[PDB]
Amino acid sequence: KITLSDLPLREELRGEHAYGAPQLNVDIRLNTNENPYPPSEALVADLVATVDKIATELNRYPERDAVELRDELAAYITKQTGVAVTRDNLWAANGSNEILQQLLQAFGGPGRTALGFQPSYSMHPILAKGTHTEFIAVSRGADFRIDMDVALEEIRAKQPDIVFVTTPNNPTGDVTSLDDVERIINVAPGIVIVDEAYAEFSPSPSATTLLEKYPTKLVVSRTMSKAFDFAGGRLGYFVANPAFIDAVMLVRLPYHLSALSQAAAIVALRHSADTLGTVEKLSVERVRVAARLEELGYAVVPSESNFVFFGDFSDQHAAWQAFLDRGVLIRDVGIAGHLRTTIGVPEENDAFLDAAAEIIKLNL
Amino acid sequence: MTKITLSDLPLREELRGEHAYGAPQLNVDIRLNTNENPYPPSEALVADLVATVDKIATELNRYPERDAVELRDELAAYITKQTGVAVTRDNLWAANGSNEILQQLLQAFGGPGRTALGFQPSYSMHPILAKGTHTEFIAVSRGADFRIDMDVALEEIRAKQPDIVFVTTPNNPTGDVTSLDDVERIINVAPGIVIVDEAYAEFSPSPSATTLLEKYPTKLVVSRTMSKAFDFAGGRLGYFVANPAFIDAVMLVRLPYHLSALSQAAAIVALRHSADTLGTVEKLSVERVRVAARLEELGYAVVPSESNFVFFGDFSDQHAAWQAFLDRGVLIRDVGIAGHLRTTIGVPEENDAFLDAAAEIIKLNL
Ligand SMILES: Cc1ncc(COP(=O)(O)O)c(CN)c1O
Ligand SMILES: Cc1ncc(COP(=O)(O)O)c(CN)c1O
Fold first, then answer.
1. Is B28 on the interface with A (CB under 8 A)?
2. GO terms for biological process (chain A)?
């Protein structure tokens, strides 16, 4: 009977734990920023017909460079952001996680550093470590926004190889203005990855509008997992100068994107207008949830995403368990006093708010 | 926008002058270059896949099941049947192709300050993935017969104490199986882990290294794929069989939710049609014998193969020979080995086209 301790694991992996929210089958799941609406019937029927057409070629490797997918991603970005781009500017992988892994491999790695503004997406430092990129944590301000004076000073002092800016931010929900992003890009010596996972939830312009001005520095990361209602499809992408595609082609695993992954995303993309209509509904529920939390007595951080960061508990994890006891699974993001709730359909939000009303009285 | 190229980006130095891996994507009517099973998925498999997608597509807004437990159950059922070795989900791990399986194992057990040892010529992604994961690669030469020279192998493993040893069997590109006794000899001298890459195992009647897992639980990992005999390259599903402790190890390095909902569901569908699909192995194996025999009759040097491809020579310029095949409508693989090319076995009409071309080409003395 052997254990992990008996295998010659890398030392730095000893005592580490596998990443991911608990997979708990409770009634109300508001913990991973998924769009709560199921894919449309029209989208599903299109997917079914598409699989029926392409399934007879599943014995063959997929198209290695995902050209058709990249064409359709470029068409989306051109329409969505107003910045003319083509497949040459687009690159796709298995989730943002793989996009970010590839970028870290090409531009981070041993002897290099990535800088982020904490608290932000927990996979950023995890992926940095996983690629042997040293992570530099710069604190956001007391309002949970980027403190630009500290940000610019620390970038200037550390000269990081990569800077992450997540906007809208996970977990806090705030947008870093494009003017502020420009200030950061200008001091950053290497590349800046602007993680726009939640961009569709904000009416303000995409960092794609800065690509023409900063081609040697700026990569804009996007996903189909959130607003695009397609997390199960595992499709992340970036938009950048075509030089960046050449870069990641050197580190990507050959045929990293399956035939079905490509074909499914293409289908989802041609139903984007209908699917993304859900952003309107979610924004209205975000407003309602945030206002109700404030009415209840909670400290709520303003958000431009599909989630709300709120506090202030003495023991957030106890509060988290108290929601869970009530059938509501939200996210403990490892931040003192605070939890993160995803905006769901109205019935889910009501259940969350009902639980929140009970829980504030427990003074946890 | 200012006009720039890759030279203007702050790329890692070691990546300068590198080239993207992969056979050229040439639209030729006879493609025999990536070791794919040439038979299309069965009507019954496709119908099942279509129905399954109609059922699970309504859940694609959600992240997939992170640990692919059902898939791992069904891979474990397959391996138990296929190799005669009782395993469960606890012994199985899946990823997006063997390539990602190998990447993850290299991350957990290779990496900076560690080494991986291979017997060249073997699968060209072993050293590439090594480099990609900052694992130093040690190339040990196979013998004149393209098989592993065991004296040299055991000597170098003893001398170098590699963190990882790769043994590919059947070997790509040469096709030879390394006997389980020889694999056992390698495992016993290896100090870290040994990854036995059985990508082509289904094509050889010989026993799997899964039969050695009980005896060497702290060292042996057996890598497998659905891309070759399993007729599912487009599904990108690779996996390994090992002691459960290795699942624990790779869970520390795998990207969360690395396997999509459709990838898991499609692989499950494929697995339930395995007996029918893997029936094609019999025809492929006999066509391989026919193809290799004709190449020899024609006058080529052919390495005896137990896989779905044949490695043959001896050209003055194998790239010229490769272009001569291309010119005749037949795409095979230049595996970057002087004098030699590798042809995948196709359907009989494809194999006949390959052999017709080979008969013309030998007369050109290229
Ligand atoms: C900022 C941010 N970026 C990237 C991701 C990852 O998305 P994906 O599903 O595309 O891997 C997330 C959450 N999942 C996120 O919050
Ligand atoms: C020995 C070997 N291992 C692994 C692979 C990769 O297979 P997959 O399609 O599962 O990533 C190949 C493919 N050519 C191979 O020849």
1. no
2. L-histidine biosynthetic process
